[PDB]
Symmetry: C2
Subunit: 318 residues, 2 copies
């Protein structure tokens, strides 16, 4: 009952119900300076340093089938990110958690992409010690980095050769951030070259991540994923737990670019889409060019976890 | 008459006139979707990818003493940046130029920092080919990266050791951009270590630039400035022209970090402040620890150029 057909099919039914809603928040809602707005109408001050300097961190939990998934792991990473950035979230954690549930519940959205953004505020970094930081919350329908119909077949990727990952000595990649100069270049290279997804090298022979997602490489029943140079994804975390539970070895360590070309399976993972199979790389088949059996087991176990009360709780909709 | 006293003194008189203005735009004005707003009231849509993904380029000409300085060089760089970003400025160049003059004239601001921002718009990079890009214009009182009283003495810098420059293979530094993850870390390191200005290495032994500015290093009458890894500043351009005119050699090429420690003089330069002497580095005097004679000649020639009709034109204020 956690097959692709079952999970994606039910989502599609929930989508058609949402499309028929007359709720003005059904297309999304934002929290700005204490008030709720329809997402298409929400506006932020142009002087905000999150805009003028991308001086911000953010995080993104999701709601699936009316259940929040690992919200507390996302709130922990956001608070760790803020500490690294010398930001202080302007709202208490319990109040943020309750606000998010209220926004989702009022929207009626059962499958939601939920974004929290903490910015430096209006003052330049030279005055960061007044900690006059700003907070924005957004709730919108679930975002698919790889659409359902493409997850059934897997998608095409390239290892980029015109762009590499911003190194950790320039920007710490364990801070989820919106400075996507490299990632945007990767989307453009993939489109130029006849693919969709881009996998960025680190400049010294190893693969890192892409614009929105971690990468997992499978070889002889061993799932390998980069340790350095990448966000420590919550999806990746779940994937490592699931793969272990099902009898596969997991390795978090350097993954040479050259290993991508000998893999049995490859997938990318992110809150915005889940487990996303990669079945073509640089124009060649990955493995058999179909969704591999280990990826499939992990995919199903990922979505099963969304109904586990250890990792999720249900929202009370009006 | 282009000494520091004369130039900064007159600016201070113009400042006190601006402070006394009852014009609601005297503190700045923004252009958003066809209308003008007081800068503190201007708001942009939260869904703009310039915010959600820092998917934008920008440029910053200045007005000094009621004269625009090298506006056409800044417009050329903005258009080159947009082409590299696959952005198309949504307004004709002549209309943008006229709008900027109108905004400055209505503000009454004689010394102005003028910012133009072109963003991807509301759609994700995957849909960049509809070119539905957005434009924002801002005019505000002149911004000083190094305040006047500190330019008289010069300021303190460090070569960062906890951060290095985002490399060109990750983000092209000739595109003026707002992805300041590395620069913000540099401001924090300098503050932690007992300085103000940060100079970022490239990771392979050479110096690049800092958060807002290029760096020029003087040794035995030779001005050296990095070619790779940095924005091609318009201030830097003017500095190279002035230094040549006055009988000094100029070199645009790799500048090893180690050369900083043997320099006779160092300054940083940017539209937001001009020519800004650095008289202490990593806790030690640069040269004699005072503004050097060559820096001083360049400083005066920089501001003299602001009255040259080859590089500047005067705004007709109401």
């Amino acid at each position: 009952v956690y097959s692709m057909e079952a999970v994606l099919g039910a989502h599609q039914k929930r989508n058609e119900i949402l499309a028929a809603s007359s709720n003005p928040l059904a297309e999304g809602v934002a929290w700005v300076e204490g008030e709720l707005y329809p997402l298409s109408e929400a506006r932020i001050p142009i002087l905000d340093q999150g805009f003028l300097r991308s001086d911000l961190t953010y995080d993104v939990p999701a709601v699936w089938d009316g259940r929040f998934f690992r919200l507390d792991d996302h709130l922990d990473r956001l608070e760790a990110s803020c500490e690294k950035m010398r930001l202080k979230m302007p709202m208490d954690r319990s109040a943020v958690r309750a606000k998010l549930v209220e926004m989702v519940a009022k929207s009626g959205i059962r499958d939601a992409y939920v974004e929290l953004i903490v910015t430096r505020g209006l003052k330049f970094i030279r005055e960061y010690q007044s900690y006059e930081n700003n907070l924005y919350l957004m709730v919108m329908p679930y975002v698919w980095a790889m659409r359902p119909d493409m997850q059934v077949t897997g998608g095409p990727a390239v290892v980029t050769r015109t762009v590499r990952r911003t190194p950790p000595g320039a920007m710490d990649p364990t801070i989820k951030n919106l400075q996507w100069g490299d990632f945007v270049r990767g989307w453009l290279e993939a489109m130029d070259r006849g693919a969709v997804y881009s996998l960025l090298p680190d400049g010294d022979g190893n693969i890192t991540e892409g614009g929105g997602y971690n990468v997992c490489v499978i070889k002889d029943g061993v799932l390998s994923t980069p340790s350095r140079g990448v966000l420590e994804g919550v999806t990746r975390k779940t994937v490592l737990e699931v793969a272990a539970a099902k009898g596969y070895k997991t390795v978090v360590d350097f993954v040479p670019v050259d290993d991508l070309y000998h893999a049995d399976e490859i997938f990318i993972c992110t809150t915005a889409g889940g487990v996303m199979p990669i079945t073509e790389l640089d124009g060649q088949k990955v493995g058999g060019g179909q969704v591999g059996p280990i990826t499939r087991e992990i995919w199903e176990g990922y979505w099963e976890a969304h109904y586990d009360p250890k990792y999720s709780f249900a929202i009370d909709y009006p």
